[PDB]
């Protein structure tokens, strides 16, 4: 592939195709559900869990 | 239980006034169970 000076070569973390990508597009409904979204609670599906939709890597350092 | 039969609406003012009258008449132990049941009914209809 021919490249110009200043064009993208690779994508980093939270970056897709040269854009900032901090989240996911998920199917969402806006309704009360048996009090499990009372106040500001959020009810989610297992698909977000076993699909690894919101899985993140966290690295600690011990010196 | 000689409860009056509400037939118009239950808004925020009505439910607050109803609970206060239940505490005076039945006490806090009875009303605590009434609150648990009304909590489920309101959640189940929302």
UniProtKB/TrEMBL annotation, chain A:
Compartment list: Plastid, Chloroplast
The record's family statement is: Belongs to the RNA polymerase beta chain family.
Oligomeric and partner information: In plastids the minimal PEP RNA polymerase catalytic core is composed of four subunits: alpha, beta, beta', and beta''. When a (nuclear-encoded) sigma factor is associated with the core the holoenzyme is formed, which can initiate transcription.
Q: What does the protein in this record do?
A: DNA-dependent RNA polymerase catalyzes the transcription of DNA into RNA using the four ribonucleoside triphosphates as substrates.
Q: What's the protein called, per UniProt?
A: DNA-directed RNA polymerase subunit beta
Q: Which organism is it from?
A: Sinapis alba
Which gene is the coding source of this polypeptide chain? rpoB
Question: What fragment of the full-length protein is this?
Answer: 632 to 694 of 1072
UniProtKB/TrEMBL annotation, chain B:
Q: Where in the cell is it found?
A: Plastid, Chloroplast
Coiled-coil region(s) at which residues?
Answer: none
Q: What does this protein do?
A: DNA-dependent RNA polymerase catalyzes the transcription of DNA into RNA using the four ribonucleoside triphosphates as substrates.
Q: Which family does it belong to?
A: Belongs to the RNA polymerase beta' chain family. RpoC2 subfamily.
Describe, as the record does, how this protein assembles with itself and its partners. In plastids the minimal PEP RNA polymerase catalytic core is composed of four subunits: alpha, beta, beta', and beta''. When a (nuclear-encoded) sigma factor is associated with the core the holoenzyme is formed, which can initiate transcription.
**Protein name, per record:** DNA-directed RNA polymerase subunit beta''
Q: Which organism is it from?
A: Sinapis alba
Q: Which residues of the full protein are shown?
A: 5 to 50 of 1373
